[PDB]
Amino acid sequence: GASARLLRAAIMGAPGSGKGTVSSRITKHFELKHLSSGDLLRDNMLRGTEIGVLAKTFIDQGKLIPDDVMTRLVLHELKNLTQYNWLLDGFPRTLPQAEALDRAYQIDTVINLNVPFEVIKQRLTARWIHPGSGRVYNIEFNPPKTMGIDDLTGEPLVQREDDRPETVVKRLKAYEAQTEPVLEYYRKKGVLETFSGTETNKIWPHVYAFLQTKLPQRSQETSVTP
Numbered sequence: 001g002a003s004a005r006l007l008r009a010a011i012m013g014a015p016g017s018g019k020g021t022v023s024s025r026i027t028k029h030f031e032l033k034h035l036s037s038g039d040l041l042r043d044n045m046l047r048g049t050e051i052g053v054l055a056k057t058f059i060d061q062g063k064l065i066p067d068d069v070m071t072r073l074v075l076h077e078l079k080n081l082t083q084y085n086w087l088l089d090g091f092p093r094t095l096p097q098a099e100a101l102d103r104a105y106q107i108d109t110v111i112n113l114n115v116p117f118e119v120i121k122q123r124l125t126a127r128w129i130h131p132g133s134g135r136v137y138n139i140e141f142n143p144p145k146t147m148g149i150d151d152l153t154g155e156p157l158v159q160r161e162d163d164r165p166e167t168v169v170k171r172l173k174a175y176e177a178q179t180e181p182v183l184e185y186y187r188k189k190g191v192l193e194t195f196s197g198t199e200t201n202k203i204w205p206h207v208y209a210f211l212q213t214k215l216p217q218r219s220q221e222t223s224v225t226p
């Protein structure tokens with residue numbers, strides 16, 4: 001369609017930054033292939049491939065899969081997608097992945113969502129479970145009537161170790177350490193576009209207006225016929 005005009009883009013953002021929502025809306029409104037490296041890894045795992053076994057090992061220890069493995073897997077998929085616009089998501093995560101990618105394809109725009117630390121920390125530590133019933137409470141959307149207590153039984157709620165504040169802080173500092181070199185690398189290339197905000201619905205209009213200058217709105221499903 002857009003003949004020598006295909007978008008090679010990447011989207012970046014901390015866990016809890018709303019990146020997942022913004023990636024959904026981009027794919028809802030524009031004609032592009034969204035390649036998510038976490039989804040490639042889940043599929044390989046689901047299919048029980050050798051990279052699926054390798055990956056599950058690391059992901060269980062919350063580590064990054066080595067750069068060469070991750071780069072090979074992604075580059076193999078992009079080989080197939082050259083005729084489409086694409087949005088890469090979760091890759092590059094490290095500076096060897098970004099340098100490697102640059103030897104194979106020219107990346108035109110990297111979208112970075114910059115949301116304050118405390119906002120991301122509040123999102124990621126918000127979930128509590130009542131173990132007996134499976135009832136979930138999210139402090140932002142449906143808080144219990146008394147904190148740490150199940151509404152219906154009065155029994156205590158618990159939080160997974162992953163959702164605890166200290167664990168979350170640790171994950172965010174690691175993500176920052178990892179991706180800060182990547183952002184600086186795209187910033188020297190002049191391809192980094194940063195969108196800052198505290199709510200995803202205030203950031204989205206700007207990302208939408210920015211990609212509309214770049215690519216084809218998916219033909220017309222106006223579903224809010226309001």
Ligand SMILES: Nc1ncnc2c1ncn2[C@@H]1O[C@H](COP(=O)(O)O)[C@@H](O)[C@H]1O
Pocket residue numbers: 037038039041058059062063064065066070090091092093094097
């Ligand atoms: N670009 C990447 N490099 C290395 N590991 C990755 C990458 N993308 C996904 N993963 C991993 O898969 C896990 C979940 O990915 P994510 O869906 O992006 O949180 C991460 O903790 C890493 O173990």
